[PDB]
Ligand binder design. Structure first.
Ligand SMILES: [Ca+2]
Ligand SMILES: [Ca+2]
Ligand SMILES: [Ca+2]
Ligand SMILES: [Ca+2]
Ligand SMILES: [Zn+2]
Length: 317
């Protein structure tokens, strides 16, 4: 759509007020953001298994209706994920070429899943029990757009260790985006959307992978065909490593001194864009991460030391 930029207001999935960038055309306001280097579109699938759906249109530029919630967050958070990458690494969208960011909410009926399908974000509204509208989780969104980022960079195959690393990178950056927007920061994934009723729980833990039965050390890795080689469980290994590198701690004898989340992002972004390949394994991931930290902070630095410590702590060498 083509019109005038406007700033509307709405309430997200969690009932919080957010400022939205909309476009005014005719007597309607559309969920179209024209304020950033990449246009952000948000569609409505009207609870049908169709894509992308109709571009969200509103009459008064006030999205406070319950049906709006999913759209509000999807539109807002997508822009925030864009802000993080642009502000921090000066990356212009997923393909570093201004590719538009489209999102479709209200997909399917009680669909408990949200994902980047290769060209856009697709969100379900959950079944109310195990999930609420999945767009209410900034870490989940950062995770998914990062997948696009990886597709346009290292292109890690979603299989075995390459896949587990692919997932880890997404978790690391999803959390980093959560911190960027100060959206009640933590190292747990999907806490804001998982089980609307039960509080305190999450999809998985970066601080303590074993809290949900995930490997926090290479020795305890899943060695089977299921889940594309345990992609979603073995990611706990790298996630723990990432956590240790950022915050520091003692794990399996090894005592790591945290170098901060900012340096963490710098190291992984560089490693993923200038070193990691499609079949990168964990040990190779260690190699690339160390080299990246070497470039950014000097071969004989405290950072490079901490990188090595983190991997040794989780059993990768
Ligand atoms: Ca309205
Ligand atoms: Ca949080
Ligand atoms: Ca979180
Ligand atoms: Ca919960
Ligand atoms: Zn993922």
């Amino acid at each position: 759509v083509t019109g005038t930029n406007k700033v509307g207001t709405g309430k997200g999935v969690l009932g919080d007020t957010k400022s939205l960038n909309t476009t005014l055309s005719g007597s309607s306001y559309y969920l179209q953001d024209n304020t950033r280097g990449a246009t952000i579109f948000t569609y409505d699938a009207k609870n049908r298994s169709t894509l992308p759906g109709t571009l969200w249109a509103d009459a008064d530029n006030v999205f406070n209706a319950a049906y709006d919630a999913a759209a509000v967050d999807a539109h807002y958070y997508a822009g925030k994920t864009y802000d993080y990458y642009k502000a921090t690494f000066n990356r212009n969208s997923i393909n570093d070429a201004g590719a538009p960011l489209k999102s479709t909410v209200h997909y399917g009926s009680n669909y408990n899943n949200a994902f980047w399908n290769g060209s856009q974000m697709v969100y379900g509204d959950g079944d109310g029990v195990t999930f609420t509208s999945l767009s209410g989780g900034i870490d989940v969104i950062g995770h998914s757009l990062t997948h696009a980022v990886t597709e346009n960079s290292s292109n890690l195959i979603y299989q075995n260790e390459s896949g587990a690393l692919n997932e880890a990178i997404s978790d690391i950056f999803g959390t980093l985006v959560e911190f960027y927007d100060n959206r009640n920061p933590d190292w747990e994934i999907g806490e804001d959307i998982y089980t609307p009723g039960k509080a305190g729980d999450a999809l998985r833990s970066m601080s303590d992978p074993t809290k949900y039965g995930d490997p926090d050390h290479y020795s305890k890795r899943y060695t089977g065909s299921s889940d594309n080689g345990g992609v979603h469980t073995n990611s706990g290994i790298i996630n723990k490593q990432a956590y240790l590198l950022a915050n520091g701690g003692t794990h399996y004898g090894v005592t790591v001194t945290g170098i901060g989340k900012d340096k963490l992002g710098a190291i992984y972004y560089r490693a993923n864009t200038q070193y990691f390949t499609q079949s990168t394994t964990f040990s190779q991931a260690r190699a690339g991460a160390v080299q990246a930290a070497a470039d950014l902070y000097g071969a004989n630095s405290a950072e490079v030391a901490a990188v090595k410590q983190s991997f040794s702590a989780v059993g990768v060498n």
